[PDB]
Amino acid sequence: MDVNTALQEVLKTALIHDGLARGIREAAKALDKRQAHLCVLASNCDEPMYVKLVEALCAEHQINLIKVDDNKKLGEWVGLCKVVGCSCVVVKDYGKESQAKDVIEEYF
Amino acid sequence: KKNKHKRKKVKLAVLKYYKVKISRLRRECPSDECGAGVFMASHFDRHYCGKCCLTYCF
Numbered sequence: 001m002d003v004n005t006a007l008q009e010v011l012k013t014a015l016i017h018d019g020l021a022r023g024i025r026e027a028a029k030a031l032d033k034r035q036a037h038l039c040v041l042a043s044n045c046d047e048p049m050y051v052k053l054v055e056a057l058c059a060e061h062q063i064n065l066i067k068v069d070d071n072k073k074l075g076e077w078v079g080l081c082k083v084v085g086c087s088c089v090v091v092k093d094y095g096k097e098s099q100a101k102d103v104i105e106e107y108f
Numbered sequence: 109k110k111n112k113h114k115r116k117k118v119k120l121a122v123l124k125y126y127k128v129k130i131s132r133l134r135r136e137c138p139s140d141e142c143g144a145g146v147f148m149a150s151h152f153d154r155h156y157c158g159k160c161c162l163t164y165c166f
């Protein structure tokens with residue numbers, strides 16, 4: 001039960017329950033709205049202001065953050081599949097509690 | 109022949125709303141539907157929320 005597998009399962013559940021906000025604009029709106037318990041970041045993105053703003057907003061809202069490696073893999077996980085490639089995700093809510101969610105909380 | 113409007117694509121528009129301590133440069137719309145997430149447009153003479161068409165002249 002690796003943290004990668006836990007993230008994949010929780011993202012799949014959130015998408016199936018429509019609790020996922022993909023993209024930097026949607027993620028920023030969800031974070032500023034005092035919602036969206038968790039956030040996922042991709043280390044592949046080459047834009048420095050991107051990661052700077054993502055981390056600054058996440059820290060200001062005081063919510064968990066995860067830095068995954070590949071933007072394309074993150075997009076394929078969040079369900080943009082040819083994969084567009086998501087470089088920042090937000091979990092507005094989880095559909096149902098699961099062992100993957102528990103593992104993510106423990107990693108937090 | 110009348111030409112159709114073409115949207116001017118802006119790259120990483122959200123990057124222009126925040127400065128990194130964080131600072132929200134664009135004013136937020138004070139409406140029940142919009143809230144803090146939605147930002148108000150800063151035109152040369154007015155603030156204009158896109159979502160609810162709320163306009164505050166200078």
Ligand SMILES: [Zn+2]
Nearest residue numbers: 137142157160
């Ligand atoms: Zn508004």
